[PDB]
Design a protein around this ligand. Structure first.
Ligand code: SAM
Ligand code: SAM
Lengths: 247, 244
Protein backbone atom coordinates (compact mmCIF):
# COMPACT_ATOMS: atom_id res chain seq x y z
CA UNK A 1 0.00 0.00 0.00
CA UNK A 2 1.13 3.54 -0.76
CA UNK A 3 0.84 6.48 1.68
CA UNK A 4 -1.87 8.76 0.24
CA UNK A 5 -1.59 11.44 2.88
CA UNK A 6 -2.12 15.04 1.86
CA UNK A 7 1.65 15.74 1.53
CA UNK A 8 2.18 12.83 -0.99
CA UNK A 9 -0.29 13.79 -3.77
CA UNK A 10 0.84 15.86 -6.87
CA UNK A 11 -2.73 17.28 -7.08
CA UNK A 12 -2.89 18.07 -3.31
CA UNK A 13 -3.94 21.67 -3.99
CA UNK A 14 -6.59 20.91 -6.56
CA UNK A 15 -10.24 20.98 -5.57
CA UNK A 16 -11.62 17.82 -4.14
CA UNK A 17 -14.50 16.15 -6.04
CA UNK A 18 -17.64 16.12 -3.90
CA UNK A 19 -19.32 13.13 -5.42
CA UNK A 20 -17.95 10.07 -7.11
CA UNK A 21 -15.06 10.31 -9.58
CA UNK A 22 -17.03 7.98 -11.95
CA UNK A 23 -19.85 10.49 -11.91
CA UNK A 24 -17.71 13.62 -12.16
CA UNK A 25 -15.81 12.28 -15.14
CA UNK A 26 -19.00 11.09 -16.84
CA UNK A 27 -20.47 14.56 -16.42
CA UNK A 28 -17.38 16.33 -17.68
CA UNK A 29 -17.02 14.26 -20.87
CA UNK A 30 -20.79 14.33 -21.55
CA UNK A 31 -20.94 18.11 -21.20
CA UNK A 32 -17.96 18.60 -23.54
CA UNK A 33 -20.16 16.97 -26.20
CA UNK A 34 -23.40 18.71 -25.09
CA UNK A 35 -21.76 22.16 -25.04
CA UNK A 36 -20.25 21.52 -28.51
CA UNK A 37 -23.65 20.50 -29.96
CA UNK A 38 -25.57 23.27 -28.14
CA UNK A 39 -23.20 25.87 -29.63
CA UNK A 40 -23.84 24.34 -33.09
CA UNK A 41 -27.58 24.62 -32.67
CA UNK A 42 -27.41 28.38 -32.22
CA UNK A 43 -28.29 30.80 -29.40
CA UNK A 44 -32.08 30.26 -29.23
CA UNK A 45 -33.36 28.40 -26.17
CA UNK A 46 -34.51 24.85 -26.65
CA UNK A 47 -37.23 22.47 -25.65
CA UNK A 48 -35.35 19.46 -24.38
CA UNK A 49 -36.77 16.10 -23.35
CA UNK A 50 -34.75 14.05 -20.84
CA UNK A 51 -36.30 10.59 -21.11
CA UNK A 52 -35.42 8.38 -18.15
CA UNK A 53 -33.98 11.47 -16.39
CA UNK A 54 -33.74 9.86 -12.95
CA UNK A 55 -32.95 12.27 -10.09
CA UNK A 56 -32.48 14.97 -12.75
CA UNK A 57 -28.80 16.01 -12.36
CA UNK A 58 -28.33 16.55 -16.18
CA UNK A 59 -31.82 17.85 -16.67
CA UNK A 60 -31.39 20.36 -13.77
CA UNK A 61 -28.14 21.60 -15.31
CA UNK A 62 -29.90 21.94 -18.64
CA UNK A 63 -32.59 24.02 -16.90
CA UNK A 64 -29.82 26.21 -15.40
CA UNK A 65 -28.87 27.18 -19.00
CA UNK A 66 -32.40 28.62 -19.54
CA UNK A 67 -34.02 25.83 -21.55
CA UNK A 68 -37.46 24.34 -20.65
CA UNK A 69 -36.78 20.76 -19.57
CA UNK A 70 -39.25 17.92 -19.50
CA UNK A 71 -38.03 15.03 -17.30
CA UNK A 72 -39.75 11.66 -17.69
CA UNK A 73 -39.11 8.56 -15.63
CA UNK A 74 -40.81 5.30 -14.73
CA UNK A 75 -39.96 5.68 -11.05
CA UNK A 76 -42.18 7.87 -8.96
CA UNK A 77 -39.38 7.95 -6.36
CA UNK A 78 -36.96 9.30 -8.99
CA UNK A 79 -39.45 11.94 -9.94
CA UNK A 80 -39.91 13.03 -6.28
CA UNK A 81 -36.08 13.08 -5.88
CA UNK A 82 -35.85 15.18 -9.01
CA UNK A 83 -38.54 17.69 -8.00
CA UNK A 84 -36.71 18.31 -4.77
CA UNK A 85 -33.18 18.63 -6.18
CA UNK A 86 -34.73 21.05 -8.70
CA UNK A 87 -36.52 23.15 -6.07
CA UNK A 88 -33.26 23.21 -4.06
CA UNK A 89 -31.48 24.62 -7.09
CA UNK A 90 -34.33 27.11 -7.65
CA UNK A 91 -35.20 25.85 -11.11
CA UNK A 92 -38.67 24.36 -10.43
CA UNK A 93 -40.13 26.99 -12.85
CA UNK A 94 -38.18 25.63 -15.83
CA UNK A 95 -39.11 21.98 -15.63
CA UNK A 96 -41.84 19.41 -16.05
CA UNK A 97 -41.96 16.00 -14.39
CA UNK A 98 -43.89 13.26 -16.20
CA UNK A 99 -44.31 9.93 -14.42
CA UNK A 100 -44.35 7.44 -17.32
CA UNK A 101 -42.34 5.14 -19.55
CA UNK A 102 -40.32 6.71 -22.35
CA UNK A 103 -42.27 4.40 -24.68
CA UNK A 104 -45.46 6.28 -23.77
CA UNK A 105 -44.03 9.77 -23.52
CA UNK A 106 -45.60 10.93 -26.83
CA UNK A 107 -49.10 10.99 -25.22
CA UNK A 108 -47.80 13.28 -22.48
CA UNK A 109 -46.17 15.83 -24.83
CA UNK A 110 -47.90 18.70 -26.65
CA UNK A 111 -45.41 19.88 -29.31
CA UNK A 112 -42.13 18.34 -30.67
CA UNK A 113 -38.71 18.79 -29.08
CA UNK A 114 -35.34 20.18 -30.27
CA UNK A 115 -33.03 17.90 -28.29
CA UNK A 116 -33.61 14.59 -26.55
CA UNK A 117 -31.39 13.20 -23.74
CA UNK A 118 -31.56 9.41 -23.45
CA UNK A 119 -28.76 8.69 -21.04
CA UNK A 120 -28.12 5.33 -19.49
CA UNK A 121 -31.56 4.02 -20.32
CA UNK A 122 -31.11 1.98 -23.55
CA UNK A 123 -29.49 -0.87 -21.57
CA UNK A 124 -32.66 -1.05 -19.41
CA UNK A 125 -35.27 -1.53 -22.12
CA UNK A 126 -36.27 -4.72 -23.87
CA UNK A 127 -37.60 -2.79 -26.87
CA UNK A 128 -34.74 -0.54 -27.93
CA UNK A 129 -35.70 -0.10 -31.61
CA UNK A 130 -39.24 0.84 -30.62
CA UNK A 131 -38.08 3.33 -28.00
CA UNK A 132 -35.72 4.90 -30.59
CA UNK A 133 -38.62 5.19 -33.06
CA UNK A 134 -40.72 6.92 -30.36
CA UNK A 135 -37.90 9.33 -29.75
CA UNK A 136 -37.43 9.94 -33.45
CA UNK A 137 -41.15 10.76 -33.80
CA UNK A 138 -41.22 13.45 -31.06
CA UNK A 139 -38.13 15.21 -32.33
CA UNK A 140 -38.28 17.95 -34.94
CA UNK A 141 -36.44 17.63 -38.26
CA UNK A 142 -32.89 18.97 -37.85
CA UNK A 143 -33.13 17.98 -34.15
CA UNK A 144 -30.52 16.06 -32.15
CA UNK A 145 -30.48 12.89 -30.09
CA UNK A 146 -27.89 12.69 -27.33
CA UNK A 147 -27.74 8.92 -26.69
CA UNK A 148 -25.47 7.55 -23.92
CA UNK A 149 -25.57 3.79 -23.54
CA UNK A 150 -23.81 1.19 -21.37
CA UNK A 151 -21.22 -0.58 -23.48
CA UNK A 152 -20.87 -4.35 -23.30
CA UNK A 153 -17.17 -4.14 -24.26
CA UNK A 154 -16.55 -1.83 -21.29
CA UNK A 155 -18.26 -4.43 -19.11
CA UNK A 156 -16.06 -7.19 -20.37
CA UNK A 157 -12.87 -5.12 -20.04
CA UNK A 158 -13.81 -4.01 -16.54
CA UNK A 159 -14.37 -7.60 -15.41
CA UNK A 160 -11.23 -8.96 -17.07
CA UNK A 161 -9.11 -6.22 -15.42
CA UNK A 162 -10.81 -7.02 -12.15
CA UNK A 163 -9.97 -10.73 -12.50
CA UNK A 164 -13.60 -11.84 -12.63
CA UNK A 165 -12.82 -14.60 -15.10
CA UNK A 166 -15.66 -16.92 -14.13
CA UNK A 167 -18.15 -14.13 -14.89
CA UNK A 168 -16.70 -13.28 -18.24
CA UNK A 169 -16.51 -16.96 -19.17
CA UNK A 170 -20.10 -17.78 -18.16
CA UNK A 171 -21.88 -14.41 -18.35
CA UNK A 172 -25.04 -13.85 -16.23
CA UNK A 173 -25.05 -4.13 -13.92
CA UNK A 174 -27.94 -3.44 -16.34
CA UNK A 175 -30.29 -5.88 -18.02
CA UNK A 176 -29.07 -5.37 -21.60
CA UNK A 177 -25.48 -4.15 -21.98
CA UNK A 178 -25.22 -2.99 -25.59
CA UNK A 179 -22.97 -3.82 -28.53
CA UNK A 180 -21.97 -0.44 -29.99
CA UNK A 181 -21.99 -1.79 -33.56
CA UNK A 182 -25.66 -2.85 -33.15
CA UNK A 183 -26.62 0.52 -31.59
CA UNK A 184 -25.08 2.45 -34.48
CA UNK A 185 -26.98 0.20 -36.92
CA UNK A 186 -30.26 0.84 -35.06
CA UNK A 187 -29.67 4.55 -35.39
CA UNK A 188 -28.75 4.43 -39.04
CA UNK A 189 -31.64 2.09 -39.89
CA UNK A 190 -34.12 4.55 -38.44
CA UNK A 191 -32.55 7.34 -40.53
CA UNK A 192 -30.53 9.19 -37.92
CA UNK A 193 -27.25 10.74 -39.04
CA UNK A 194 -24.43 10.07 -36.53
CA UNK A 195 -22.32 13.15 -35.84
CA UNK A 196 -20.02 11.90 -33.14
CA UNK A 197 -19.02 9.02 -30.85
CA UNK A 198 -17.34 9.46 -27.49
CA UNK A 199 -16.17 6.87 -24.99
CA UNK A 200 -17.18 7.80 -21.45
CA UNK A 201 -14.58 6.54 -18.92
CA UNK A 202 -12.07 4.88 -21.25
CA UNK A 203 -9.25 4.58 -18.71
CA UNK A 204 -10.71 5.48 -15.27
CA UNK A 205 -12.29 2.14 -14.46
CA UNK A 206 -9.29 0.10 -15.54
CA UNK A 207 -6.61 1.79 -13.35
CA UNK A 208 -4.55 -0.71 -11.39
CA UNK A 209 -4.34 1.63 -8.36
CA UNK A 210 -7.89 2.81 -7.99
CA UNK A 211 -6.91 5.56 -5.55
CA UNK A 212 -5.44 7.39 -8.62
CA UNK A 213 -8.97 7.97 -9.85
CA UNK A 214 -9.26 10.62 -7.14
CA UNK A 215 -5.65 11.48 -6.38
CA UNK A 216 -4.79 12.06 -9.99
CA UNK A 217 -8.28 13.08 -11.22
CA UNK A 218 -7.23 16.17 -13.18
CA UNK A 219 -4.35 14.46 -14.97
CA UNK A 220 -6.71 11.56 -15.73
CA UNK A 221 -9.38 13.94 -17.03
CA UNK A 222 -6.91 15.58 -19.40
CA UNK A 223 -6.00 12.16 -20.91
CA UNK A 224 -9.58 10.90 -21.04
CA UNK A 225 -10.47 14.14 -22.86
CA UNK A 226 -7.52 13.62 -25.27
CA UNK A 227 -8.29 10.04 -26.29
CA UNK A 228 -11.99 9.46 -25.71
CA UNK A 229 -12.98 10.29 -29.34
CA UNK A 230 -10.48 7.91 -30.99
CA UNK A 231 -10.65 4.16 -31.49
CA UNK A 232 -10.10 1.85 -29.80
CA UNK A 233 -10.81 4.05 -26.72
CA UNK A 234 -14.32 4.91 -27.80
CA UNK A 235 -15.18 1.23 -27.82
CA UNK A 236 -13.56 0.69 -24.42
CA UNK A 237 -15.72 3.33 -22.78
CA UNK A 238 -17.94 2.18 -19.92
CA UNK A 239 -20.57 4.23 -21.72
CA UNK A 240 -20.62 5.56 -25.28
CA UNK A 241 -22.18 8.92 -26.01
CA UNK A 242 -23.40 9.13 -29.59
CA UNK A 243 -24.82 12.41 -30.93
CA UNK A 244 -27.19 11.98 -33.78
CA UNK A 245 -29.26 14.33 -35.84
CA UNK A 246 -32.61 13.76 -37.55
CA UNK A 247 -32.43 15.21 -41.12
CA UNK B 1 0.40 -27.16 -10.64
CA UNK B 2 0.52 -30.74 -11.96
CA UNK B 3 -0.82 -29.77 -15.37
CA UNK B 4 0.82 -26.33 -15.30
CA UNK B 5 4.42 -27.39 -15.63
CA UNK B 6 3.60 -29.75 -18.47
CA UNK B 7 1.72 -27.09 -20.50
CA UNK B 8 4.15 -24.17 -20.22
CA UNK B 9 7.63 -23.33 -19.08
CA UNK B 10 7.54 -22.48 -15.36
CA UNK B 11 11.07 -20.99 -15.77
CA UNK B 12 9.61 -18.59 -18.34
CA UNK B 13 7.45 -15.51 -17.91
CA UNK B 14 3.68 -15.55 -18.37
CA UNK B 15 4.13 -12.67 -20.85
CA UNK B 16 6.40 -14.74 -23.08
CA UNK B 17 4.40 -17.93 -22.72
CA UNK B 18 1.11 -16.24 -23.61
CA UNK B 19 2.69 -14.41 -26.55
CA UNK B 20 4.04 -17.72 -27.86
CA UNK B 21 0.76 -19.59 -27.32
CA UNK B 22 -1.36 -17.07 -29.20
CA UNK B 23 1.22 -16.66 -32.00
CA UNK B 24 1.34 -20.44 -32.48
CA UNK B 25 -2.46 -20.73 -32.65
CA UNK B 26 -2.23 -18.49 -35.71
CA UNK B 27 0.90 -20.11 -37.14
CA UNK B 28 -0.52 -23.59 -36.80
CA UNK B 29 -3.68 -22.48 -38.47
CA UNK B 30 -1.72 -20.96 -41.41
CA UNK B 31 0.58 -23.93 -41.75
CA UNK B 32 -2.41 -26.27 -42.08
CA UNK B 33 -4.14 -24.06 -44.67
CA UNK B 34 -0.86 -23.98 -46.65
CA UNK B 35 -1.16 -27.75 -47.13
CA UNK B 36 0.75 -30.70 -45.73
CA UNK B 37 3.97 -30.07 -47.65
CA UNK B 38 7.09 -28.91 -45.79
CA UNK B 39 8.01 -25.23 -46.19
CA UNK B 40 10.96 -22.94 -46.72
CA UNK B 41 10.57 -20.35 -44.00
CA UNK B 42 12.56 -17.15 -43.56
CA UNK B 43 12.74 -15.77 -40.03
CA UNK B 44 13.91 -12.22 -40.65
CA UNK B 45 15.21 -10.71 -37.38
CA UNK B 46 14.83 -14.11 -35.71
CA UNK B 47 16.94 -13.24 -32.67
CA UNK B 48 17.81 -16.21 -30.44
CA UNK B 49 15.55 -18.37 -32.59
CA UNK B 50 12.82 -19.43 -30.15
CA UNK B 51 10.19 -19.32 -32.81
CA UNK B 52 12.44 -20.42 -35.73
CA UNK B 53 13.32 -23.50 -33.70
CA UNK B 54 9.67 -24.35 -32.98
CA UNK B 55 9.09 -24.02 -36.71
CA UNK B 56 11.98 -26.30 -37.53
CA UNK B 57 10.70 -28.74 -34.85
CA UNK B 58 7.50 -28.94 -36.97
CA UNK B 59 9.82 -30.26 -39.71
CA UNK B 60 10.19 -27.25 -42.02
CA UNK B 61 13.42 -25.80 -43.46
CA UNK B 62 14.04 -22.55 -41.56
CA UNK B 63 16.40 -19.74 -42.53
CA UNK B 64 17.19 -17.25 -39.81
CA UNK B 65 18.70 -13.84 -40.58
CA UNK B 66 19.59 -11.22 -38.07
CA UNK B 67 21.70 -8.06 -37.96
CA UNK B 68 23.33 -9.12 -34.74
CA UNK B 69 26.19 -11.60 -34.86
CA UNK B 70 25.58 -12.31 -31.16
CA UNK B 71 21.92 -13.29 -31.72
CA UNK B 72 22.96 -15.70 -34.41
CA UNK B 73 25.43 -17.40 -32.00
CA UNK B 74 22.65 -17.98 -29.48
CA UNK B 75 20.26 -19.26 -32.18
CA UNK B 76 22.73 -21.89 -33.43
CA UNK B 77 23.63 -22.96 -29.88
CA UNK B 78 19.96 -23.19 -28.97
CA UNK B 79 19.24 -25.02 -32.27
CA UNK B 80 21.75 -27.73 -31.38
CA UNK B 81 20.52 -28.08 -27.78
CA UNK B 82 18.77 -30.66 -31.76
CA UNK B 83 17.21 -29.25 -34.90
CA UNK B 84 20.42 -27.87 -36.43
CA UNK B 85 19.79 -29.83 -39.67
CA UNK B 86 16.61 -27.92 -40.48
CA UNK B 87 18.19 -24.57 -40.11
CA UNK B 88 20.37 -22.11 -41.88
CA UNK B 89 21.81 -18.87 -40.50
CA UNK B 90 22.56 -15.52 -42.21
CA UNK B 91 24.22 -12.50 -40.64
CA UNK B 92 22.65 -9.51 -42.42
CA UNK B 93 19.89 -6.87 -42.36
CA UNK B 94 16.51 -8.07 -43.62
CA UNK B 95 16.88 -5.27 -46.20
CA UNK B 96 19.87 -7.11 -47.64
CA UNK B 97 18.52 -10.67 -47.51
CA UNK B 98 17.71 -11.37 -51.21
CA UNK B 99 21.32 -11.86 -52.36
CA UNK B 100 21.77 -14.44 -49.63
CA UNK B 101 18.78 -16.57 -50.80
CA UNK B 102 19.13 -19.22 -53.52
CA UNK B 103 15.38 -19.27 -54.25
CA UNK B 104 12.15 -17.65 -53.03
CA UNK B 105 10.52 -18.66 -49.72
CA UNK B 106 6.99 -19.88 -48.85
CA UNK B 107 6.54 -18.15 -45.45
CA UNK B 108 8.18 -15.20 -43.79
CA UNK B 109 8.23 -14.52 -40.04
CA UNK B 110 8.91 -10.91 -39.15
CA UNK B 111 8.27 -10.80 -35.42
CA UNK B 112 8.94 -7.88 -33.16
CA UNK B 113 11.14 -6.13 -35.70
CA UNK B 114 8.95 -3.53 -37.42
CA UNK B 115 8.93 -1.28 -34.41
CA UNK B 116 12.74 -1.05 -34.53
CA UNK B 117 13.34 -0.01 -38.10
CA UNK B 118 13.44 3.46 -39.57
CA UNK B 119 12.31 2.19 -42.99
CA UNK B 120 9.38 -0.11 -42.30
CA UNK B 121 7.74 0.25 -45.69
CA UNK B 122 10.97 -0.46 -47.50
CA UNK B 123 11.68 -3.54 -45.38
CA UNK B 124 8.15 -4.91 -46.00
CA UNK B 125 8.78 -4.49 -49.73
CA UNK B 126 12.03 -6.46 -49.52
CA UNK B 127 10.17 -9.27 -47.73
CA UNK B 128 7.54 -9.24 -50.50
CA UNK B 129 10.33 -9.47 -53.04
CA UNK B 130 11.75 -12.73 -51.66
CA UNK B 131 8.40 -14.40 -51.14
CA UNK B 132 6.77 -16.60 -53.75
CA UNK B 133 3.37 -15.68 -55.26
CA UNK B 134 0.81 -17.23 -52.92
CA UNK B 135 3.25 -17.05 -49.99
CA UNK B 136 2.49 -15.72 -46.56
CA UNK B 137 3.84 -13.08 -44.29
CA UNK B 138 3.48 -13.55 -40.52
CA UNK B 139 3.97 -10.01 -39.17
CA UNK B 140 3.99 -9.30 -35.39
CA UNK B 141 4.50 -5.72 -34.38
CA UNK B 142 4.59 -3.80 -31.11
CA UNK B 143 1.33 -1.87 -30.83
CA UNK B 144 1.25 1.79 -29.84
CA UNK B 145 -2.24 1.39 -28.37
CA UNK B 146 -1.23 -1.45 -26.14
CA UNK B 147 1.69 0.66 -24.94
CA UNK B 148 -0.65 3.56 -24.17
CA UNK B 149 -3.15 1.40 -22.34
CA UNK B 150 -0.40 -0.37 -20.38
CA UNK B 151 0.92 3.00 -19.21
CA UNK B 152 -2.49 4.37 -18.37
CA UNK B 153 -3.42 1.29 -16.37
CA UNK B 154 -0.09 1.59 -14.54
CA UNK B 155 -0.78 5.25 -13.66
CA UNK B 156 2.09 6.64 -15.73
CA UNK B 157 0.03 9.68 -16.70
CA UNK B 158 2.88 12.14 -17.16
CA UNK B 159 4.59 9.75 -19.54
CA UNK B 160 1.44 9.36 -21.65
CA UNK B 161 0.79 13.10 -21.51
CA UNK B 162 4.26 13.68 -22.98
CA UNK B 163 3.55 11.28 -25.82
CA UNK B 164 5.64 8.37 -24.52
CA UNK B 165 9.05 9.58 -25.80
CA UNK B 166 11.58 6.70 -25.87
CA UNK B 167 13.27 6.49 -22.45
CA UNK B 168 13.54 -2.81 -24.11
CA UNK B 169 11.94 0.37 -25.51
CA UNK B 170 11.33 0.04 -29.22
CA UNK B 171 11.90 3.33 -31.02
CA UNK B 172 8.75 3.11 -33.11
CA UNK B 173 5.66 1.39 -31.69
CA UNK B 174 3.21 1.10 -34.55
CA UNK B 175 -0.33 2.24 -35.22
CA UNK B 176 -2.20 -0.84 -36.48
CA UNK B 177 -4.47 1.23 -38.73
CA UNK B 178 -1.35 2.53 -40.43
CA UNK B 179 0.33 -0.90 -40.68
CA UNK B 180 -2.76 -2.36 -42.33
CA UNK B 181 -2.75 0.46 -44.85
CA UNK B 182 0.92 -0.08 -45.55
CA UNK B 183 0.25 -3.78 -46.27
CA UNK B 184 -2.80 -3.11 -48.42
CA UNK B 185 -1.25 -0.35 -50.49
CA UNK B 186 1.69 -2.60 -51.20
CA UNK B 187 -0.60 -5.38 -52.50
CA UNK B 188 -0.78 -7.80 -49.59
CA UNK B 189 -4.10 -9.53 -48.87
CA UNK B 190 -4.75 -9.45 -45.16
CA UNK B 191 -5.92 -12.86 -43.93
CA UNK B 192 -6.11 -12.38 -40.14
CA UNK B 193 -5.49 -9.94 -37.28
CA UNK B 194 -4.84 -11.08 -33.76
CA UNK B 195 -4.10 -9.14 -30.56
CA UNK B 196 -1.24 -10.69 -28.56
CA UNK B 197 -1.83 -10.16 -24.81
CA UNK B 198 -5.12 -8.23 -24.90
CA UNK B 199 -5.92 -8.60 -21.15
CA UNK B 200 -2.81 -10.02 -19.43
CA UNK B 201 -0.81 -6.85 -18.99
CA UNK B 202 -3.78 -4.88 -17.71
CA UNK B 203 -4.89 -7.11 -14.84
CA UNK B 204 -5.30 -5.21 -11.64
CA UNK B 205 -3.95 -8.15 -9.52
CA UNK B 206 -0.85 -9.13 -11.44
CA UNK B 207 -0.51 -12.37 -9.45
CA UNK B 208 -3.47 -13.59 -11.50
CA UNK B 209 -1.28 -13.77 -14.59
CA UNK B 210 0.34 -16.85 -13.09
CA UNK B 211 -2.30 -18.01 -10.62
CA UNK B 212 -5.06 -18.02 -13.25
CA UNK B 213 -2.92 -18.54 -16.33
CA UNK B 214 -4.97 -21.28 -17.98
CA UNK B 215 -8.28 -19.39 -17.48
CA UNK B 216 -6.63 -16.24 -18.81
CA UNK B 217 -5.28 -18.10 -21.81
CA UNK B 218 -8.81 -19.28 -22.57
CA UNK B 219 -10.25 -15.77 -22.41
CA UNK B 220 -7.42 -14.31 -24.45
CA UNK B 221 -7.93 -17.08 -27.06
CA UNK B 222 -11.65 -16.28 -27.25
CA UNK B 223 -11.48 -12.51 -27.61
CA UNK B 224 -8.14 -11.67 -29.17
CA UNK B 225 -9.39 -11.83 -32.78
CA UNK B 226 -12.20 -9.33 -32.49
CA UNK B 227 -12.34 -5.57 -31.98
CA UNK B 228 -11.63 -3.74 -29.78
CA UNK B 229 -9.48 -6.37 -28.19
CA UNK B 230 -7.22 -6.88 -31.19
CA UNK B 231 -6.29 -3.19 -30.93
CA UNK B 232 -5.42 -3.56 -27.24
CA UNK B 233 -2.86 -6.28 -27.86
CA UNK B 234 0.66 -5.54 -26.73
CA UNK B 235 1.58 -6.91 -30.08
CA UNK B 236 -0.62 -7.47 -33.12
CA UNK B 237 -0.02 -10.50 -35.35
CA UNK B 238 -1.15 -9.98 -38.90
CA UNK B 239 -1.11 -12.73 -41.47
CA UNK B 240 -1.03 -11.60 -45.07
CA UNK B 241 -0.82 -13.27 -48.45
CA UNK B 242 1.13 -12.25 -51.53
CA UNK B 243 -1.47 -12.80 -54.31
CA UNK B 244 -1.06 -15.80 -56.62
C1 SAM C 1 -29.35 4.27 -14.38
S1 SAM C 1 -30.53 5.46 -14.44
C2 SAM C 1 -29.99 6.81 -15.30
C3 SAM C 1 -30.59 8.14 -14.78
C4 SAM C 1 -30.19 9.45 -15.46
N1 SAM C 1 -30.63 9.57 -16.83
C5 SAM C 1 -28.70 9.63 -15.41
O1 SAM C 1 -28.10 9.86 -16.49
O2 SAM C 1 -28.16 9.52 -14.31
C6 SAM C 1 -31.80 4.87 -15.36
C7 SAM C 1 -33.13 5.58 -15.07
O3 SAM C 1 -34.05 5.16 -16.06
C8 SAM C 1 -35.31 4.88 -15.39
N2 SAM C 1 -35.97 3.97 -16.33
C9 SAM C 1 -35.70 2.65 -16.56
N3 SAM C 1 -36.47 2.19 -17.61
C10 SAM C 1 -37.16 3.25 -18.10
C11 SAM C 1 -38.17 3.48 -19.16
N4 SAM C 1 -38.58 2.46 -19.95
N5 SAM C 1 -38.71 4.72 -19.31
C12 SAM C 1 -38.30 5.75 -18.52
N6 SAM C 1 -37.45 5.59 -17.51
C13 SAM C 1 -36.81 4.41 -17.28
C14 SAM C 1 -34.96 4.37 -14.01
O4 SAM C 1 -36.04 4.47 -13.02
C15 SAM C 1 -33.73 5.22 -13.70
O5 SAM C 1 -34.08 6.41 -12.94
C1 SAM D 1 13.07 -7.92 -30.20
S1 SAM D 1 13.89 -8.90 -31.27
C2 SAM D 1 12.85 -10.14 -31.78
C3 SAM D 1 13.47 -11.54 -31.98
C4 SAM D 1 12.48 -12.61 -32.51
N1 SAM D 1 11.96 -12.31 -33.85
C5 SAM D 1 11.34 -12.78 -31.56
O1 SAM D 1 10.16 -12.79 -31.97
O2 SAM D 1 11.60 -12.94 -30.35
C6 SAM D 1 14.31 -8.01 -32.62
C7 SAM D 1 15.41 -8.70 -33.43
O3 SAM D 1 15.50 -8.13 -34.74
C8 SAM D 1 16.91 -7.95 -35.06
N2 SAM D 1 16.89 -6.88 -36.06
C9 SAM D 1 16.58 -5.58 -35.83
N3 SAM D 1 16.58 -4.89 -36.97
C10 SAM D 1 16.84 -5.78 -37.96
C11 SAM D 1 16.96 -5.68 -39.41
N4 SAM D 1 16.80 -4.51 -40.02
N5 SAM D 1 17.28 -6.80 -40.10
C12 SAM D 1 17.48 -7.94 -39.45
N6 SAM D 1 17.36 -8.13 -38.13
C13 SAM D 1 17.06 -7.07 -37.35
C14 SAM D 1 17.57 -7.67 -33.74
O4 SAM D 1 19.00 -7.97 -33.66
C15 SAM D 1 16.80 -8.57 -32.81
O5 SAM D 1 17.42 -9.88 -32.71
Amino acid sequence: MQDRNFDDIAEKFSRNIYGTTKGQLRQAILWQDLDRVLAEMGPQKLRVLDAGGGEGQTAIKMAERGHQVILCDLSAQMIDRAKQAAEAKGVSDNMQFIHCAAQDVASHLETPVDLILFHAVLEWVADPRSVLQTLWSVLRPGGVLSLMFYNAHGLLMHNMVAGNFDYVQAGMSPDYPRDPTQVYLWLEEAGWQIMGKTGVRVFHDYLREKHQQRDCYEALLELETRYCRQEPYITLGRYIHVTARKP
